[PDB]
Write a protein that binds this ligand. Structure first.
Ligand code: CLA
Ligand code: CLA
Ligand code: CLA
Ligand code: CLA
Ligand code: CLA
Ligand code: CLA
Ligand code: CLA
Ligand code: CLA
Ligand SMILES: CCCCCCCCCCCCCCCCCC(=O)OC[C@H](CO[C@@H]1O[C@H](CO)[C@H](O)[C@H](O)[C@H]1O)OC(=O)CCCCCCCCCCCCCCCCC
Ligand SMILES: CC1=C(/C=C/C(C)=C/C=C/C(C)=C/C=C/C=C(C)/C=C/C=C(C)/C=C/C2=C(C)CCCC2(C)C)C(C)(C)CCC1
Ligand code: SF4
Ligand code: SF4
Ligand code: FES
Lengths: 143, 73, 73, 53, 97, 80, 743, 42, 73
């Protein structure tokens, strides 16, 4: 069921000159993200944190401090260029966790192997009044 | 005295307009029909549907305190 | 002078609080079906008339009080 | 020839290497301060620091 | 007025009658050659097509690139067929790129 | 963690999914509409509370709702 | 490669088709409107040409003809000024006696009792005293009759017509194409040498033949109607030979290179004319001559068609070093394909220039009878300060627009821009620290002084008598300037100004034109306040520019566009995270900075320079040196400056200065009114308009264009514009009423 | 001409002409019957 | 300030301040324990309202008591 690709260190990363928008202490102590793509040729692309970098012909692996920054770079790579990307989340443990695209197909394309999470079978106008859930820990929408 | 008493009347009416509008619109309006399940005080409902800055009832109170200060002034 | 101003400012803050807690009630503790068609629900259901007329009264007072003051000036 | 380099050559850590940040004498000086005397008992570093302050 | 509308489609190519004041997609449903749709309000790619001949009114358009209007693409749900135009169906992704 | 809910008025347009910055939403099979699709929110622990998804919902009222809730460092979008 | 005129014939046919259609340029607008928001958008994007299309050629053609339209408007304004000076003025009476008659070139019609504004300005005339300083310009140009003013007004009218026609022509009949605009070498060659070089040479030619002799005659005391007409000075030359003997040789000195034989009317005196209180005209003529020579040579630097010259690309890409990589390589391609880059550069430079102009004009008064016309001086300084500030803020606005819309490292890559984008965080952090430090050590000194004075401890205060903070550098510099003439500028007799020193007070008609300005502790404090405010507004604007494309907060800020409300209340709340919002603040801080600057100027001038001279040489100033001791605490500003100076405007009612009192109060009102837009949000207003719409619908009187509350950005725009209008207008009324009553 | 008639009836121009006419009327009225605090005819 | 300037501006300023603190010698030896964040939206509206009203009350009380106390009549 779509064994996710395993992160391959020794994959080169784009030619960058350095920036003050890179990683910080949060990447040291809690987590950071890593995105990979494959680059038909060596080109210039705008970095989601600073200026411009040069993606190498062949595997490109970039480490960002925010998942949102990764998805932004992924969107730019995917529609301005035509490049398929995947990103992971790395903990200070040395664990990696394949993040996107979760089940091999982009989420804008329906896949028959996904379950419904957080779906309510009613229209939004049929939530109970807050008075109905007073003094119980539940929220009227979580129902 | 006449002119300033009518200034007072305007102050009272506008403050009560703000507060009553905040109270009667607390459970929801046409711009946000499901306001009641968001609580009494919240930021806004994002920039969609034209923008919903200061849509709480807390925001109505917040706006009415200015008019209260002005009228008591 | 101090006593008068003190008590008037305190009264203004108290009035604003009364209306704020009216709104908080309407959000948190109001039950529509238990209040079916009584005075509270019927207040809620013609809120547009109340708000529009409060706005008319305040517009009239403001327009004319400011206009008379500016004419005199 | 270029003077400003990424930190330790890693261009994805949020900092740079410049003259004020990383030139020989300024590195030696900063390292020779009680605060950055890592292998020294903390009490004596506190003494030196406290006396100067 | 009611100019004939031609639509290439994986089902084939059919001809239907519909007045210039109405969307091609709306009268298509009245005849019965099924087409895709979702929002029905001109703000999505679902009902996308492109044209072979003629051109449709771009007045009923929104949420489109400042080019999708003149590069060929169009929305069946929000479009008035000013002539005997020939259009494509099931054209979302080669529009989605 | 903010809480995102999807209601059955969803027409499965998928504009909201294509709008979210953090890949919280998804498209899943269904049978209640003509697209046989509906939006799911399996990863709300990454939701920043941006509510771009609500501005992309063409239904009235909305079919995708974001209720801001307890904040995390993921929820606050903090890089430090 | 070579440069030529390249045109297109009849690109757009003049027609009334699109006038009937509202927002033809915007596809969405053209169709029509569903709500009230459509009307606001129509105006907000009328002149944003680079978004109506994507063709650079069309953008630049539109820009060219819009410039023509603006020039026409300016000419119409000038002709109106000249005509009002010709017909509804007391310019001739003022010309007979300058330092008793008050200049005024506007009368009002007696409709509702407003004729009280027709005050006694002297000269058998009743009108509204003007502060434009136009009378001084006309006197310095040699204009003695109102026939000359009439001729000038009509000439400017036909020039406005010509400009309007040229605007129509260069857009609808003969519109240039892109390669014509993208030629900047020849454009610079012509603007340096042709517009500024020939312009200033032509003006020096005017002053040599018209202003010099006519002003000589006027200063000799001749009745203005007994003066020869200017053309006589050209026909009969011995008329000039009498005033200026070395007009006898007549241009043979210019070719023998015996230029010293011209030392008569081409001087290097410096200082002021003790009779008129302005600069020597024989100095201004020499100045413009030298300026002309300099610009005429300078407009020959860039290569256009004949090999000689400089390629701007070569000059740019020759400059690079070890700190900046390949700097300046690729800027020529950036500055010739994006109008916003050029616009922001030019706006920054023009604002800087306007403020330099204000300073130099207050310090070295160029026009006769200008220095002792205190109202004109104050108004000119204040007006130019405001204009400069606004332009400088617009510079930042358009730098941000460039960064968002036109910056592209894929096709147009520059190194320096990239490096600054790469260490923007260090830049902004250090600017932040400087703002904080400067704010603590300038305003904190004022707070310390206020509490030291309120605790009955004046010895502990930061003042001239307790704890001196003397600006030793400024004092040293101005003493160096005072000693300059004869020591290190041997060809000058007087120092370039009288604020430097040397004594030599100059007065005119019993009023003080100029005297040495002393710098004490209060000057130190207020100068550091100035530095602080400038640094903070620079911080806001630079932070807006550097972080316009992306940040650590929202990673794709450019996709949201240059101007937008927010991206939801996520990540904690992203209210005003856009570049446009940064410009909105900068305007607030620019207002603060310029306000403090003009207050400083006005108080210091009314306290240490202006005033009335007397028979012994005893100078009583407007305020007896109350700036040196009272300006060091905020209570002094509130009491001695605002409360004291404010009394003039409050008592204006019942006199001819009543309009200033009215504008004082009205500006207070509109300023307070702005706060309704600046403190609230559009959600409350949409919800209120909902019930108002209900009230209308109940009576079949609801409109079809659905009324919406303003956009979030529009509400901020209405709030900031009203705020600025209110504040600037109340300061305007206060200044004018005060300086016209006490001046 | 037809289009000029149209443009001259667009909202801003229609309203400026209307308000200029109204201003002229009120100005002349108060120029003939000035300083009027009441209605003194009947 | 809290009423005109909004959260986004301040949040980004705070984040660059955080960078600056983490990057400097002799002071990165000290670490905060809560990540500094700009005030909330509702929190900022509250703080601004509190400042506004406190300033209001204090300046008017000063003026009233000083102007009546000065003349004592
Ligand atoms: C001096 C500042 C000021 C002024 C004049 C107003 C005025 C007004 N406020 Mg407001 N308000 C203010 C400050 C101010 N507010 C502040 C600081 C806040 C806190 C944020 C609020 C919050 C607030 C709220 C929440 C509400 C109001 C409302 C109102 C309206 C009340 C109705 C009325 O009185 O009739 C009119 C009074 C006037 C003073 C209007 C006079 C302006 C005249 C018409 C100008 C005439 C134009 C003239 C022909 C020339 C124009 C110039 C030209 C360039 C166009 C009124 C227009 C209430 C409302 O909407 O009423 C329904 C409302 O709900 N205010
Ligand atoms: C920026 C330029 C400017 C400005 C601000 C003014 C302002 C003023 N002018 Mg002036 N004027 C100007 C340029 C200007 N003028 C020019 C360029 C000329 C021709 C060289 C004149 C000739 C002129 C004359 C002869 C008179 C004025 C008068 C006035 C005052 C009355 C306003 C008015 O027009 O009455 C009321 C406004 C109207 C009746 C509507 C104007 C409609 C006319 C037909 C022209 C506009 C039509 C337009 C093209 C469409 C007023 C303060 C009058 C005055 O000073 O009173 C003592 C007066 O008699 N002006
Ligand atoms: C009930 C109150 C009231 C009324 C009815 C009036 C009425 C009047 N006032 Mg008054 N005023 C009032 C109160 C009032 N005022 C108060 C309270 C004050 C104290 C602040 C004043 C102070 C005041 C002053 C100082 C003046 C007036 C003037 C006037 C008169 C003309 C105003 C004018 O013509 O504008 C301006 C008209 C023009 C500028 C004409 C221009 C025509 C248009 C705009 C031309 C546009 C076309 C152009 C070609 C476009 C360019 C395009 C280009 C590219 C081709 C008018 C009868 C003026 C006057 O008396 O005239 C001498 C005047 O000077 N008032
Ligand atoms: C000696 C030649 C010369 C002169 C005097 C000027 C003068 C001027 N240029 Mg221009 N320009 C020139 C050559 C020249 N240019 C060349 C060679 C190019 C490139 C091919 C350009 C391209 C250019 C552009 C793109 C723009 C200007 C602009 C301007 C105006 C700037 C605004 C100003 O300062 O107002 C000062 C006002 C005056 C000096 C009033 C006098 C106006 C006189 C009559 C102008 C006549 C000079 C003109 C070149 C005559 C040739 C046309 C002829 C066939 C009739 C100004 C009038 C700006 C503009 O167009 O404004 C509308 C602007 O956008 N110029
Ligand atoms: C563009 C500026 C300008 C212009 C148009 C003129 C024009 C003129 N100058 Mg002149 N001049 C100028 C600048 C100018 N000057 C400057 C800057 C100086 C100072 C160096 C002089 C110094 C000068 C002298 C000494 C004389 C003229 C004279 C003349 C006139 C002689 C006619 C002729 O033969 O030629 C003529 C109308 C002669 C004259 O006065 O004619 C009666 C004459 O004797 N000029
Ligand atoms: C040579 C100077 C210059 C030029 C050519 C431009 C040109 C442009 N600017 Mg700009 N700007 C400038 C200076 C300049 N600016 C300065 C000095 C500032 C600082 C304030 C700004 C700040 C600025 C901002 C913030 C923005 C622009 C924008 C724009 C673009 C669209 C403008 C527009 O159509 O809006 C329409 C014009 C109006 C709606 C006019 C508004 C009326 C004003 C606010 C009232 C003025 C009151 C008046 C003086 C007195 C009161 C009158 C009343 C009482 C009757 C356009 C290309 C906009 C853009 O998006 O760029 C792409 C944008 O948002 N500019
Ligand atoms: C750093 C903020 C700052 C700023 C923006 C200004 C700005 C200004 N000063 Mg000033 N000044 C400053 C600090 C500053 N000063 C300090 C710290 C002192 C010593 C107490 C002075 C003493 C001073 C005098 C005596 C005079 C001025 C004057 C002036 C004005 C003319 C320019 C000038 O002569 O400056 C000159 C500034 C300097 C020579 C010192 C600059 C600071 C240097 C570059 C190092 C920065 C110090 C830093 C804060 C501490 C060390 C860094 C640390 C991290 C290791 C001008 C507006 C003149 C004036 O008042 O005009 C009317 C005047 O005569 N200043
Ligand atoms: C650094 C301070 C300073 C400044 C601002 C000036 C400024 C000036 N000097 Mg001066 N000078 C100075 C120092 C200074 N000087 C010193 C230390 C001495 C030796 C004691 C002199 C000796 C001196 C003499 C003898 C003369 C001047 C003159 C002048 C004036 C003409 C400038 C000039 O010749 O064009 C620039 C000349 C160039 C060749 C351009 C080169 C650009 C420079 C070298 C860089 C000018 C305002 C002349 C004068 O009297 O004015 C009317 C003149 O005769 N100076
Ligand atoms: C000012 C009067 C404008 C008159 C006008 O536009 O109508 C006259 C025409 C519009 O009128 C049109 O004219 C066309 C041929 O020119 C055709 O004959 C159309 O049938 C006719 O409707 O426009 C102009 O010719 C005015 C040009 C600009 C004048 C300024
Ligand atoms: C005896 C006498 C008389 C009479 C009098 C009278 C008749 C009285 C009165 C009065 C009145 C008549 C008063 C009142 C007031 C009121 C108010 C002030 C109100 C209020 C309300 C509120 C505030 C509300 C709240 C709320 C809400 C909002 C909603 C929910 C519910 C609640 C309730 C919570 C006279 C003088 C003639 C003569 C002498 C003797
Ligand atoms: S700008 Fe308004 S709508 Fe947007 S996040 Fe802030 S309060 Fe909410
Ligand atoms: S709040 Fe933002 S991140 Fe969360 S689901 Fe909506 S658009 Fe996506
Ligand atoms: S079905 Fe969405 S635009 Fe047609």
């Amino acid at each position: 069921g779509f064994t996710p690709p395993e992160l391959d260190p020794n994959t080169p990363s784009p030619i960058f000159g350095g920036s003050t928008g890179g990683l910080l202490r949060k990447a040291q102590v809690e987590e950071f993200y890593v995105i990979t793509w494959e680059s038909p040729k060596e080109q210039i692309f705008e970095m989601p944190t600073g200026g411009a970098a040069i993606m190498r012909e062949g595997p490109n692996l970039l480490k960002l401090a925010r998942k949102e920054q990764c998805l932004a770079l992924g969107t730019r790579l995917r529609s301005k260029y035509k490049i398929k990307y995947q990103f992971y989340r790395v903990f200070p443990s040395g664990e990696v966790q394949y993040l996107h695209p979760k089940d091999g197909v982009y989420p804008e394309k329906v896949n028959p192997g996904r379950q419904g999470v957080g779906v309510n079978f009613r229209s939004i106008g049929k939530n109970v009044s807050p008075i109905e859930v007073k003094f119980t820990g539940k929220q009227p929408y979580d129902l | 005295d006449f002119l300033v008493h009518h200034a007072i009347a305007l102050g009272l009416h506008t403050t009560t307009l703000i507060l009553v509008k905040g109270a009667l619109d607390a459970r929801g309006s046409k711009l946000m029909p499901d306001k009641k399940d968001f609580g009494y005080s919240f930021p806004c409902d994002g920039p969609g549907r034209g923008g919903t800055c200061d849509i709480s009832a807390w925001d109505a109170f917040y706006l009415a305190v200015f008019w209260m200060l002005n009228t008591i002034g | 002078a101090a006593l008068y101003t003190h008590h008037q400012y305190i009264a203004g803050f108290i009035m604003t609080g009364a209306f704020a807690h009216g709104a908080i009630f309407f959000i948190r503790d109001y039950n529509p079906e238990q209040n079916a068609d009584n005075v509270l629900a019927r207040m809620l259901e013609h809120k547009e008339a109340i708000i529009s007329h409060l706005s008319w009264a305040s517009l009239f007072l403001g327009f004319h009080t400011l206009g008379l003051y500016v004419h005199n000036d | 020839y270029q003077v400003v380099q990424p930190i330790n050559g890693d261009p994805f850590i949020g900092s740079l290497e410049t003259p004020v940040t990383s030139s020989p004498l300024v590195a030696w000086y900063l390292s020779n301060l009680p605060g950055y005397r890592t292998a020294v008992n903390p009490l004596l570093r506190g003494i030196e620091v406290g006396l100067a302050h | 007025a009611s100019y004939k509308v031609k639509l290439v489609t994986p089902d084939g190519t059919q001809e239907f009658e519909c007045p210039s004041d109405v969307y091609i997609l709306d009268h298509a449903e009245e005849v019965g050659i099924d087409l895709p749709y979702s929002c029905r309000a001109g703000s999505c790619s679902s009902c996308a097509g492109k044209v072979v001949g003629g051109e449709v009114d771009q007045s009923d358009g929104s949420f489109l690139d400042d080019e999708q209007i003149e590069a060929g693409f169009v929305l069946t749900c929000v479009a008035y067929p000013t002539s005997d135009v020939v259009i494509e169906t099931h054209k979302e992704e080669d529009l989605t790129a | 963690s903010h809480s995102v809910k999807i209601y059955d008025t969803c027409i499965g347009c998928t504009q909201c999914v294509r709008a979210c910055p953090t890949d919280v939403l998804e498209m899943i099979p269904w049978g209640g509409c003509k697209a046989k699709q509906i939006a799911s929110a399996p990863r709300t622990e990454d939701c920043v509370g941006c509510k771009r998804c609500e501005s992309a919902c063409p239904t009235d009222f909305l079919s995708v709702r974001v209720y801001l809730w307890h904040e995390t460092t993921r929820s606050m979008g903090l890089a430090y | 490669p070579e440069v030529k005129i390249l045109v297109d014939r009849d690109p757009i046919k003049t027609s009334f088709e699109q006038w009937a259609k509202p927002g033809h340029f915007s596809r969405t607008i053209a169709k029509g409107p569903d709500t009230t928001t459509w009307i606001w958008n129509l105006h907000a994007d009328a002149h944003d040409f680079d978004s109506h299309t994507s063709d650079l050629e069309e953008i630049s053609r539109k820009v060219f003809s819009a410039h023509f339209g603006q020039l026409s408007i300016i000419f119409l304004w000038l002709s109106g000024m000249y005509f009002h000076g010709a017909r509804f003025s007391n310019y001739e009476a003022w010309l007979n006696d300058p330092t008793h008659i008050r200049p005024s070139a506007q009368v009002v019609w007696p409709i509702v009792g407003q004729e009280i504004l027709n005050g006694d300005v002297g000269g058998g005339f009743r009108g509204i005293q003007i502060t434009s300083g136009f009378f001084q310009i006309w006197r310095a140009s040699g204009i003695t009759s109102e026939l000359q003013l009439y001729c000038t007004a009509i000439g400017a009218l036909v020039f406005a017509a010509l400009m309007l026609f040229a605007g129509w022509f260069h857009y609808h009949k003969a519109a240039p194409k892109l390669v014509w605009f993208q030629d900047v070498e020849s454009m610079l060659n012509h603007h340096l040498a042709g517009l500024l070089g020939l312009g200033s040479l032509s003006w020096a030619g005017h002053q040599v033949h018209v202003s010099l002799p006519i002003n000589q005659f006027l200063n000799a005391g001749v009745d203005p109607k007994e003066i020869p007409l200017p053309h006589e000075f050209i026909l009969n030359r011995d008329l000039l030979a009498q005033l200026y003997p070395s007009f006898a040789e007549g241009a043979t000195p210019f070719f023998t290179l015996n230029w010293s034989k011209y030392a008569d009317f081409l001087t290097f005196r410096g200082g002021l004319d003790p009779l008129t209180g302005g600069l020597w005209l024989t100095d201004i003529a020499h100045h413009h001559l030298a300026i002309a020579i300099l610009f005429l040579i300078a407009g020959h630097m860039y290569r256009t068609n004949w090999g000689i010259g400089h390629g701007i690309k070569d000059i740019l890409e020759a400059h690079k070093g070890p700190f900046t990589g390949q700097g300046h390589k690729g800027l020529y391609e950036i500055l010739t394909t994006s109008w916003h880059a050029q616009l922001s550069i030019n706006l920054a430079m023009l604002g800087s220039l306007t403020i330099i102009v204000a300073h130099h004009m207050y310090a070295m008064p160029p026009y006769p009878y200008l220095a002792t016309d205190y109202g004109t001086q104050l108004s000119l300084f204040t007006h130019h300060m405001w204009i400069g500030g606004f332009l400088i803020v617009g510079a930042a606005a358009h730098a941000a627009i460039f960064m968002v819309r036109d910056y592209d490292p894929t096709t147009r890559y520059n190194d320096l821009l990239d490096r600054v984008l790469r260490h923007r965080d260090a830049i902004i952090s250090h600017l932040n620290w400087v703002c904080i430090f400067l704010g603590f050590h300038s305003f904190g000194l004022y707070i310390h002084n206020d509490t030291m004075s309120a605790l009955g401890r004046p010895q502990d205060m930061f003042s001239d008598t307790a704890i001196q903070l003397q600006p030793v550098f400024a004092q040293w510099i101005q003493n160096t300037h005072a000693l300059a003439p004869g020591t290190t500028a041997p060809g000058a007799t007087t120092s370039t100004s009288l604020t430097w020193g040397g004594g030599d007070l100059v007065s005119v008609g019993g009023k003080v034109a100029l005297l040495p300005i002393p710098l004490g502790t209060a000057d130190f404090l207020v100068h550091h306040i100035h530095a602080f405010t400038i640094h903070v507004t620079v911080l806001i604007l630079l932070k807006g520019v550097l972080f316009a494309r992306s940040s650590r907060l929202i990673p794709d800020k450019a996709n949201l566009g240059f101007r937008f409300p927010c991206d939801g209340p996520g990540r904690g709340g992203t209210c005003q995270v856009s570049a446009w919002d940064h410009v909105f603040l900068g305007l607030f801080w620019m207002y603060n900075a310029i306000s403090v600057v003009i207050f400083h100027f006005s108080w210091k001038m009314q306290s240490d320079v202006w005033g009335s001279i007397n028979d012994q040489g005893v100078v009583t100033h407007i305020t007896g040196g109350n700036f040196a001791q009272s300006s060091i605490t905020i209570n002094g500003w509130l009491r001695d400056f605002l409360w004291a100076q404010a009394s003039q405007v409050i008592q204006s009612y019942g006199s001819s200065l009543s309009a200033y009192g009215l504008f004082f109060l009205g500006a207070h009102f509109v300023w307070a009114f702005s706060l309704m837009f600046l403190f609230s949000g559009r959600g409350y207003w949409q919800e209120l308009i909902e019930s108002i719409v209900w009230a209308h619908n109940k009576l079949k009187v609801a409109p079809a264009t659905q009324p919406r509350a303003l956009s979030i950005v529009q509400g901020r725009a209405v709030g900031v514009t009203h705020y600025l209008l209110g504040g600037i207008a109340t300061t305007w009324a206060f200044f004018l009423a005060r300086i016209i009553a006490v001046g | 001409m037809r289009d000029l008639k149209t443009y001259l009836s667009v909202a801003p121009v229609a309203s400026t002409l209307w308000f200029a006419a109204l201003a002229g009327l009120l100005i002349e009225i108060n120029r003939f019957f000035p300083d009027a605090l009441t209605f003194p005819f009947f | 300030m809290f009423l005109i300037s909004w959260r986004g501006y301040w949040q980004e300023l705070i984040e660059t301040l955080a960078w600056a603190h983490e990057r400097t010698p002799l002071a990165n030896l000290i670490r905060w324990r809560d990540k500094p964040v700009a005030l909330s939206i509702v929190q900022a509206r509250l703080v601004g309202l509190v400042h506004f009203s406190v300033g209001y009350i204090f300046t008017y009380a000063a003026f009233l008591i000083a102007s009546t106390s000065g003349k004592f009549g």
